[model samples]
Target chain A: EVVKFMDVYQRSYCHPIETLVDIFQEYPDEIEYIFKPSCVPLMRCGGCCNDEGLECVPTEESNITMQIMRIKPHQGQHIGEMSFLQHNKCECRPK
Target chain B: VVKFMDVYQRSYCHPIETLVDIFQEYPDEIEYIFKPSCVPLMRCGGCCNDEGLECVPTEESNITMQIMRIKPHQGQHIGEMSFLQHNKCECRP
Candidate 1:
């Protein structure tokens, strides 16, 4: 409708970006480290749900244990986590 | 999820209840849980012979026999037999 600049009408935009931003704004008092965006994505799935499950650690100390696998330095595990958060991405995975 | 449920139940939940019971029953002997080291002959492979591990019953909140009360630290429960339970899951969750 901008008269001569009709090309603007032909372009497209991405999905509602910054989905995780919404979560950070919501749960400010979370205990375990909850990553932004994908931590609370626009669409929730099973895999990320697992991470979401871990993001909570109860108050009882003896009732809990944490397993942290550094995996390998500069390996796919690290890159995969980094890449997931690097760009606007979600933790949803294929079967 | 069932595959993981057993690990959750056997390793953490069960031992948590066990510790809670022991603490509830005998708050006096808790010093045993906070000792600095153990005798190797009876340590059963370092599980009972801790060097610097300590237990604090505060509240915080893991499978993870490989865990730290906080993190970025070594596994405190590494071989502490007091924590090592009768369940296989407890041995290595």
Candidate 2:
């Protein structure tokens, strides 16, 4: 028999801060460079993980570097055409 | 007065190698960690640069790290839900 308890794992739920701390301990180096939360969208292209996920384009790295270089207080998307092209899922190439 | 010549810059086109070299010189550290061209998509989310560009997501870094960790001979897309969540531009949250 399979029994699924709805509230049985309530106590197991981790506090947000605790979870963050654990993640930080695992990857301290990355946590040091906290970027704007919005930057994630640039890496999706619909062909990742066997067409089941999004993929990252090379230009995104350049833009990220640009942000780090400027040290801008707030993240903005001023990267230009590369922006749209980067997010485009379809790799439309003329046959 | 303005001058517009269709072929005036014919000799100015730099070779791909030279262009790459210049870029490499500008950022030598990044050159060593080459990533798949598709990885850039994980960073775009529409609200970047004031509605005129794409944004990078946090998951992209994780995925990149994962790739580097496995050192897989060929790049594959298999990170699961995070992958889809990372690339969605609508920001449905």
Candidate 3:
């Protein structure tokens, strides 16, 4: 019997928690904030899976909410909130 | 006195090897095969130089799509399979 095989490219895969994104899209200009950096690291399911029977995906994740405090231009203070997903674990599982 | 404080902290990308198992299938009778113990995978890893910096992939890195064939059993064949491999890394802010 003759055997044959083919090549398959994966669109996505499990990756580490290294992706970064902006926590706050915009800040009020009225407040003189002290947040030098507004971007935070995040975990995402990406990359490529080799096997056809498996898929790269996230196994565990948690919801995180970040809060920021801002000072008013000349008055009180301002507060803001931002939420995003934090993937704890990623793995290749059955498709 | 400040000499100890200014060591010029360094962060860079490096290569590391890992072992991975090759999965095979052969129709209804066999769900998978246990051949080709594993393969070597080159990955990139390193520490960030600063709080705003991160180790990420650079344009110098070459990545493309390709396919491979596998023969699991007699008169059986599998087609169209590919995987991503990491080979380079860089520190960026």
Candidate 4:
């Protein structure tokens, strides 16, 4: 049986996700800072797996650090780093 | 438990001996008349690391046939005919 034509050729693979983040130094402060590029594509893994068969998953990945600016409540700003995982490769395997 | 030492691996194609039955016009009578009932041929076989990839023939040669007579029939013969022979194989997506 077949369903979801859009998922006919679905497989585990790496894709890009557009992301935007807000940086704040204090919890009560309303000051906010914006990251460069406003929004950028981040490498991520996505796809579908068969119901009773193998599952799509990431096989290889790497960590990436991004620099952003954080604004304080007063008038001070600090530079910091953000870390996340970037999918390099993907495959379909038994869960 | 996780699988042991199952990391990234390369895939390649290799030749394997396979037996195939020869077909002719007369289904039942041709079996007994044919010189060789079955012939061994080289076929492609390999394993692809990825599920989406498949092993396929990357190179092929022509197998030319000479004039031959058919079974259970008189004044019937086949001229030159060409068939594809697998020479190399590779994993394809």
Candidate 5:
């Protein structure tokens, strides 16, 4: 029942796509990348909605949830794995 | 050039055979044991001579030469190696 996890978070006023593109450029060797868009408010009645009222959330206010990237060595002979994870209203900060 | 060595020396009033026996009993896992006997005369020379002058050296005052032992694991599958070494008439003690 023991589980291990690595977490990362970043806070800024920049666009999510711009930020993600920067991250991808910096880590070009990453074999995989996963990104989740921002959060939506859930109503007491069990439905979720965003501030726009269109059911779509704004990327600026959304939380980037998680990312997993694997870097392979010697053309897939070896794999080095890394992940970026974040949660809504998280207090932790990335270095 | 690099050479690795492990040195051990004991001065005792007891017999060498008795000392060896005690060493063996304490470490039961040691599989192989090698023992070299002592030499006579606490002095030095090109071709050695003893105080007893019996042509054959006396064991009491002699220096034990060398001993090597290898302990094997799991029915002699692998051996942990060790060696003992000594030289005669060297001042670099």
Candidate 6:
């Protein structure tokens, strides 16, 4: 579970494919990269004698994507529609 | 911090690697992908939504649109990228 959590967290880093946009224009192919970092709630017990531990989910991709898109609403629409992700619920920890 | 190189060593270009991604492979677009350091990218109106990122030059990273020199094919910047780093941590210069 620890390994899985770390994997999900790290894979969550965003790196856009410049060529995806290039092709989107010339060829208009669907952009698909293997790793799609997203939130999946994690539940972990603190210790053996502990009563309860913590259940949490990480949230940041939406904001990350939005910021990038805000820079270019054109590419934003292409990717935004392709991903089918909706930011209906933002569960970020109170900052 | 100058010990023998560890597998986890700092990079020289790690600075700009934040806002810009250098390599784009489909391996298509028989053109330079990044302007790299020590150069500037030309501005294009038709390239994607951001030509600020278009790496067109071989000389200046002055990426002459051999196409643009003759034809007016606006750079189509599509998959350019930017930050999400520990941006709050400013290095004390």
lDDT of 2 by residue, A29-86 (tens): 5433333322222222232221224322332222211121112345533321111112
lDDT of 1 by residue, B1-93 (tens): 112233222222111222112233335653333211111011111111112332223222211121112123433333212332222211221
Please write out the lDDT profile of model 3 over residues A1-95, one tens digit for every residue.
11222211222234544554443343344235443224444565654456557776888898765554444446665455545687788897897
Per DockQ, what order, best first? 3, 2, 6, 4, 1, 5
Pick the winner on lDDT between candidates 2 and 5.
2
The DockQ assigned to candidate 6 is: 0.02
Model 1 off-target regions past 4 Å?
A1-4, A7-22, A31-38, A43-95, B1-93
Each prediction's whole-model lDDT (CA): 0.22, 0.23, 0.45, 0.42, 0.22, 0.22
Q: Residues A1-95, candidate 1, lDDT per residue (tens digit)? A: 11111121111111112212222334455334332111222211111112212321112111112221122334322112221121223332233
- Residue-wise C-alpha lDDT for candidate 4, range A55-95, written one tens digit per residue: 54677888755554444446676655555566787665776
True contacts kept of each: 0.00, 0.03, 0.05, 0.00, 0.00, 0.00
TM-score ranking from best to worst? 3, 4, 2, 5, 1, 6
Best model per DockQ? 3
For model 5, the docking class works out as incorrect
| Model 1, TM vs. native | 0.14
Q: Which ten residues in a row have the lowest lDDT in candidate 5 chain B?
A: B1-10
Q: How displaced is residue B13 in candidate 4, in Å? A: 2.4
- B1-93: candidate 4 lDDT, tens digit per residue: 111121112113444443333343236554233322222345565455445667678888664443233455445444443335578887688
Predicted candidate 2 versus true structure: per-residue lDDT over B1-93, tens digit per residue = 111121112111111110011123225334333222122112332223233433344442222112121124644442211122243222222
Compared with the true structure, model 6 gives a TM-score of 0.13
- Give TM-scores of chain A for all candidates: 0.19, 0.19, 0.46, 0.49, 0.21, 0.18
Say which prediction, candidate 1 or candidate 4, comes out ahead on TM-score.
4
Return model 6's CA RMSD, one decimal.
22.7
Comparing candidate 5 with candidate 6, which one achieves the higher lDDT? 5
Candidate 3 local lDDT, residue B27: 33
Q: Tell me how each candidate scores on DockQ against the true complex.
A: 0.01, 0.03, 0.08, 0.01, 0.00, 0.02
